Amino acid sequence: SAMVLLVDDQAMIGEAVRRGLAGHESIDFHFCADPHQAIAQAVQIKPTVILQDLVMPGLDGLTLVREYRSNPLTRDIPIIVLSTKEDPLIKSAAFAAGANDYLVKLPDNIELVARIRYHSRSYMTLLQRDEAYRALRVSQQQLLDTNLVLQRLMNSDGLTGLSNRRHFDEYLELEWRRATRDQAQLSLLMIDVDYFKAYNDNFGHLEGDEALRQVAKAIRNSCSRPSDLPARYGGEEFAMVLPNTSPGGARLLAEKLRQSVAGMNIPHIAPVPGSSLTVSIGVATVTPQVGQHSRQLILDADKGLYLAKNNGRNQVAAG
Amino acid sequence: SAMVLLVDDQAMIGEAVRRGLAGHESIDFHFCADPHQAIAQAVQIKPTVILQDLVMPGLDGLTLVREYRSNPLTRDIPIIVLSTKEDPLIKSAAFAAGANDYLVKLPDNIELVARIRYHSRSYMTLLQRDEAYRALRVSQQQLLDTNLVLQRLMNSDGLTGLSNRRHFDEYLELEWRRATRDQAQLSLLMIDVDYFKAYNDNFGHLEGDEALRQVAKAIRNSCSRPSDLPARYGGEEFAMVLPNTSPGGARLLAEKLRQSVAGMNIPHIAPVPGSSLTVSIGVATVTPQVGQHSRQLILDADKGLYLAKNNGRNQVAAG
Amino acid sequence: SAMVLLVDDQAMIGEAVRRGLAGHESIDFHFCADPHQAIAQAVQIKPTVILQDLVMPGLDGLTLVREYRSNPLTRDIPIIVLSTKEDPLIKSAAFAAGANDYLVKLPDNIELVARIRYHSRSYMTLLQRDEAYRALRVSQQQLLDTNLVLQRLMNSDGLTGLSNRRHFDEYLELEWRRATRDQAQLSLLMIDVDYFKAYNDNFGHLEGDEALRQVAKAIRNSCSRPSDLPARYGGEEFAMVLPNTSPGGARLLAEKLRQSVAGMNIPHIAPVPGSSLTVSIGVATVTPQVGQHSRQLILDADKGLYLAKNNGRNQVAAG
Amino acid sequence: SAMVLLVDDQAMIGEAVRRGLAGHESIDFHFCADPHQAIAQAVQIKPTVILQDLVMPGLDGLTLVREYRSNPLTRDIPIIVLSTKEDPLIKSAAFAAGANDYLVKLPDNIELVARIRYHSRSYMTLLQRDEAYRALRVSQQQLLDTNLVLQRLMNSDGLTGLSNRRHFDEYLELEWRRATRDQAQLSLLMIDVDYFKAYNDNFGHLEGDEALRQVAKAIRNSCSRPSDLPARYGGEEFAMVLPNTSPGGARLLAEKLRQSVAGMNIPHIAPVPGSSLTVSIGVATVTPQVGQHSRQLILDADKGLYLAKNNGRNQVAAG
Ligand SMILES: Nc1nc2c(ncn2[C@@H]2O[C@@H]3COP(=O)(O)O[C@H]4[C@@H](O)[C@H](n5cnc6c(=O)[nH]c(N)nc65)O[C@@H]4COP(=O)(O)O[C@H]3[C@H]2O)c(=O)[nH]1
Ligand SMILES: Nc1nc2c(ncn2[C@@H]2O[C@@H]3COP(=O)(O)O[C@H]4[C@@H](O)[C@H](n5cnc6c(=O)[nH]c(N)nc65)O[C@@H]4COP(=O)(O)O[C@H]3[C@H]2O)c(=O)[nH]1
Ligand SMILES: Nc1nc2c(ncn2[C@@H]2O[C@@H]3COP(=O)(O)O[C@H]4[C@@H](O)[C@H](n5cnc6c(=O)[nH]c(N)nc65)O[C@@H]4COP(=O)(O)O[C@H]3[C@H]2O)c(=O)[nH]1
Ligand SMILES: Nc1nc2c(ncn2[C@@H]2O[C@@H]3COP(=O)(O)O[C@H]4[C@@H](O)[C@H](n5cnc6c(=O)[nH]c(N)nc65)O[C@@H]4COP(=O)(O)O[C@H]3[C@H]2O)c(=O)[nH]1
Ligand SMILES: Nc1nc2c(ncn2[C@@H]2O[C@@H]3COP(=O)(O)O[C@H]4[C@@H](O)[C@H](n5cnc6c(=O)[nH]c(N)nc65)O[C@@H]4COP(=O)(O)O[C@H]3[C@H]2O)c(=O)[nH]1
Ligand SMILES: Nc1nc2c(ncn2[C@@H]2O[C@@H]3COP(=O)(O)O[C@H]4[C@@H](O)[C@H](n5cnc6c(=O)[nH]c(N)nc65)O[C@@H]4COP(=O)(O)O[C@H]3[C@H]2O)c(=O)[nH]1
Ligand SMILES: Nc1nc2c(ncn2[C@@H]2O[C@@H]3COP(=O)(O)O[C@H]4[C@@H](O)[C@H](n5cnc6c(=O)[nH]c(N)nc65)O[C@@H]4COP(=O)(O)O[C@H]3[C@H]2O)c(=O)[nH]1
Ligand SMILES: Nc1nc2c(ncn2[C@@H]2O[C@@H]3COP(=O)(O)O[C@H]4[C@@H](O)[C@H](n5cnc6c(=O)[nH]c(N)nc65)O[C@@H]4COP(=O)(O)O[C@H]3[C@H]2O)c(=O)[nH]1
Ligand SMILES: [Sr+2]
Ligand SMILES: [Sr+2]
Ligand SMILES: [Sr+2]
Ligand SMILES: [Sr+2]
């Protein structure tokens, strides 16, 4: 829309303007003959452009152009100064004081509406851009948190915080392809807590969760290369994909981890009283060929996991 | 920033401007003496305000003010017309042709920069508001679909599409409170497919899912009041909360539904060969009192469900 | 699979069994002639059924049946006692000690495998049910938290915690239908912070968010009936759907809220220095008719909101 | 719980059992003297173990042991055969017919309850494991689809399907670290549609979305190595991270893509009538050093993007 605040001592100007603007529904008029209600009414009606007379009843017009740019409730409103006539410093001061125009009362009702229409409309879109900035900041900060949640949750196992299975499955599939392009050594650790049902059954399911937690922490601490990925494979089972790692490297890493767990010395009553939580690990490493399916790597790890288990638990074996 | 395209036949004007603007890094200048590259260069440099001479080498200046407002690649760029001197229709035409100003070459380098600074800056924020409109439309349509997904998924059971359990639990809790304020009759249907393990075992788990589907559809068709809510309570179990429904009303609704299922005549081999899928229903209705826990309503439905089951299945009984 | 631990002093029994079971790949055998490694090997091989001789080299067979049911690492393994011959208390003791069978060495290799096959297979599915219990508990507690997130997030505005817009839109649509069935009075509050751009601009966007927060809290405190719903309508705009509330009731509620906000006395510099954060509210209440679109209620609230605004802000007006 | 179906011709046996089981609330009894309602009642009461007499009123007991294992509604129920006395093939047949025990009517009420308690309880947990299998299959297939949604949605831009910004930001951060370990050449393409506001404004926002779509498709087709990642950087901006790619390689890839877009020959009216949609691209490639921040790579791409733009659009330039 449009709203012009006129401010001028003489009713004869307030009238000319009122008349020029009657045949324009798009734009409304508001006369303010009392320069000591000027900024007040400016705040109240929310004008989109104000017209300011430079000489009034013993109150400097430029003093008011001062306040307009001074009070930030008006700071941004376009100001056309109405003068009689064309004096020097008073046109230069107009602008020094913040005026955006300096007009002689009055051009015809064409340039008058044009000029009004222009400044008004600019202010309007100034309001709009600011409004948009707000709304965008909101939406952007809604997607802000939306992104945290689905991430901490899509790809993370809540209990341990390690990656989850579907992240593992999908991550490992990616790494398989990367590996085959680079003819790189892709290694995989398959990790299981020994005698876990037995732990779960006399300590409690929560106590087992807490146990899983501590083991999950040790896993997270074994690997520390950008592409090392630790995951909860499924329940008591953990995995750990190690791109670019040799069989001997993987095994070394596996043994430091196994020792770590045992070393926490977590009380278990299996296989015998006095026992502490142990962990069996299957190691497996492959350089993928085209056409080869990543499941081969998993199977190899499970062979290793199965071997380690069938040779006394708490040990590492390559499948 | 700021970019002024000057377009004027005389190098002496291109020079004055160039000079006025040298001591201003914020604003860059670009002279275009050839009015037959005017719009071309306008497109190329992306000016934020153009200054147009009205008389040039035998090419109407207002013809170019025409094109500027004509080509939408420039449509929105503020135009200050530079004239010599102040002729009549040529100021009125300035604006009729789209000009936003009409200046006499040249005011001092204060009003010249002021005026330039103003129009430039308005255009700038015109660009910004439009940019924001785009970005907001994107974000808003990201939350658009984001909302569909989590909704079709937070509150809906995928297989049947009925509400899910947590929606049921939470919805029923709400309705319990509404009911106790209104001392209204809150009814609940607890629905189970008879001999479902037996169905699942010789037809297949998928075939059972499809069976669940058809039953889920019938449930959805029994209730049709704004607050009626059908849910998959858990597996072979369905629920259906009926606010504002009498015991006799609930029972009537229960019997139409039970008949419906039986009537689909879905082949089952239990309890005997030749049988068709049946359904047992527990009815229960309560007017909640303060302090009373909604679990009472559920228990009552299960009594009914249990009774119906222990009296030959395929029937409705109030607990 | 199947794994039988035999424990018997005489190699001649260990042999008969070994022989009976050779032609059965499904089932593996393990002889334990030394009753002082019995439970040890039981732990190591994870048998699915153990056969226990009642008399051995000076170590009571029933003492071992004691330990089997004693150590929980074996607690659940089925025990067939092998005796010679059929003595009294020794069959009754067999069971008193935990035995699940009492056989005479030896039935033919049909009943022997049958019996073994049965107990073994039961234990097997005992293991399976327990495994399933674990895995189900996991999945269920994954959907546990999955449900919190999408809920606290699908339907809640993060900043204020009030409902969000899409929840409002959808909730109000539901309540419209409920209302038209009950020919009930549905009221709606449309709430806006007065001079918010002005607040946002000199205090900071965060400070405005914090301002929004405090106002959001007051809203949440105005309504307290099961179906009252407070929402962030969009930015500086809040809504509040009040089912079953009279026009006069809605207005009363509106005025207590408006006073509350003003009373927090939150420093604003608009409309004038020394001002405190105020709020304009639009009230509107409808009894919905069939065919009537809920948008009518919203429009009525906005009329009220618009009126209140155009009469000095910080007030309530019915549209 | 426990439910024994006895089936025997003589009431005197039905009585002994009834009596043995009265002092046991955990277990209920059900006598079936009419062998021609046997399976019928088996279906009706859902027994957890049935006791079967081998000789009855002119109806073979083993015929009924046949049906029990025959009808799958009973298939899994444990069967203790009650005989008088101990005949040969009739114990071997007992098992051949499916019996799980063969008892002489009757042992004392200790072994009788023991034996009953055992088979009953096994069946019970057979039911439980199956129940669990169902419930787990449900939960697992809820996480099934839950995973699709948040994935197709967390990491994918809906409109183009390319990765989104947060995936880009996070993916590129990962690749930066991988790159610095391998001292590998990490390249990045920054892609922008030339004159897009101009396209959006006279064709329509949807038409621009469709335009974005077609361009997004071409991008997706340029890169095809496991680690190449195409993303919508923000609105009209696209990105494309190319691990392990030389500056010259990146540029080659950039030029094939740019040509592709231009070649679709999508009608635009800018910069001039008759124009087709073009695209500007910034190329940049870095071998990351420790301590170096990935933002360097982005800046370099933007320099290139900026250069390309400030040299006529529709071209590739390295920043
Ligand atoms: N013209 C061309 N096409 C490219 C280029 N980069 C990837 N592609 C396209 O994408 C397909 C395979 O991408 P891959 O995942 O890298 O995975 C590759 C990779 O592991 C291996 N491979 C093929 N040739 C080479 C090579 O020259 N160097 C390396 N390091 N690996 C290669 O074989 C697998 C698939 O072979 P493809 O069937 O050839 O099929 C290629 C091809 O159609 C390229 O620089 N030029
Ligand atoms: N995927 C993965 N594998 C791991 C990790 N830590 C050790 N390894 C495996 O075990 C081998 C070396 O372990 P090293 O005793 O730490 O002894 C290391 C160390 O002293 C040095 N080195 C290698 N990279 C780094 C590094 O990024 N930081 C530091 N401080 N030293 C490194 O070189 C020696 C052996 O190099 P490698 O041949 O690379 O071979 C590695 C690798 O295959 C890990 O966090 N993730
Ligand atoms: N001063 C005031 N407070 C209000 C009003 N509406 C709800 N509240 C507040 O919210 C609490 C209970 O809301 P309820 O869920 O409607 O659920 C209500 C409802 O089911 C019932 N109830 C209390 N009085 C009335 C009543 O006069 N009419 C009806 N239809 N129900 C009532 O008792 C339950 C809780 O009683 P309360 O402990 O009293 O506690 C009330 C009270 O502190 C109100 O118009 N005026
Ligand atoms: N929660 C729920 N309950 C249902 C539904 N359909 C039937 N009932 C239950 O069964 C009673 C009447 O069923 P009626 O035979 O359809 O016969 C109806 C019908 O002819 C008329 N009536 C009630 N409301 C409607 C309506 O919304 N549409 C139409 N066409 N008739 C209605 O009044 C008669 C009985 O009114 P009631 O006392 O309300 O009592 C209802 C109610 O307790 C349903 O979709 N949801
Ligand atoms: N035979 C039968 N059908 C039922 C019953 N309850 C709801 N329906 C079905 O669902 C449609 C409208 O449900 P509405 O949302 O309750 O919303 C209702 C409600 O606001 C009003 N309405 C219709 N009759 C009654 C009535 O007898 N009592 C009340 N309190 N409202 C009614 O008109 C709206 C829609 O009218 P409908 O076109 O008739 O169409 C009904 C009808 O086809 C019922 O008890 N019996
Ligand atoms: N949607 C909604 N509306 C609200 C709420 N609080 C007040 N109202 C509105 O304002 C009217 C009464 O406010 P009252 O002064 O609290 O004074 C209340 C109060 O003393 C009593 N009353 C009504 N329900 C409750 C209640 O649930 N708890 C308590 N303690 N008193 C109640 O009855 C008098 C007036 O009853 P009303 O006619 O119901 O009419 C209500 C209602 O239309 C609210 O939390 N939510
Ligand atoms: N003892 C031991 N620790 C390991 C090993 N692998 C990674 N880490 C640990 O994780 C930190 C950095 O992992 P980065 O992301 O691979 O990223 C690495 C990588 O880009 C580079 N870097 C360090 N040494 C080597 C190296 O011997 N070979 C290669 N290819 N890169 C290295 O410097 C960056 C960080 O250096 P750091 O501060 O040393 O710190 C190392 C170290 O504390 C290992 O095999 N042995
Ligand atoms: N990140 C990324 N970069 C790409 C892709 N396609 C081409 N390039 C870039 O451009 C160079 C070669 O493009 P070439 O003409 O396809 O010609 C290729 C091609 O004939 C052969 N080659 C390389 N890998 C493959 C492949 O995976 N499949 C096939 N069929 N040929 C390949 O070797 C020649 C040049 O090898 P380069 O040195 O690797 O260097 C590549 C690389 O830096 C791509 O899909 N992703
Ligand atoms: Sr005057
Ligand atoms: Sr001239
Ligand atoms: Sr012996
Ligand atoms: Sr008999």
What does this structure look like?
Four copies of one chain form a homotetramer. In chain A, the strands form two sheets. In chain A, strands 2-1-3-4-5 form a five-stranded parallel beta sheet, with helices on both faces. A five-stranded mixed beta sheet of chain A has the order 7-8-6-9-10, sandwiched between helices. In chain A, strand 4, helix 4 and strand 5 form a beta-alpha-beta unit. The longest helix of chain A has 44 residues. Chain A is built from ten helices and ten strands. Chain A is of the alpha/beta class and 319 residues long. The relative contact order of chain A is 0.09. The radius of gyration of chain A is 39 Å and the shape is rod-shaped. Chain A has two domains: 138 residues, Response regulator (Rossmann fold); 181 residues, Reverse transcriptase/Diguanylate cyclase domain (Alpha-Beta Plaits, 2-Layer Sandwich), CATH 3.30.70. In chain A, helix 7 packs across helix 8 and helix 8 packs across helix 9. Chains in contact: A-B, A-C, A-D, B-C, B-D, C-D. Chains A and D meet through helix 5 and helix 6 of A and helix 5 and helix 6 of D. The complex binds ligand C2E (8 copies) and strontium ion (4 copies). The site of one ligand C2E has 10 residues of chain C, from helix 9.
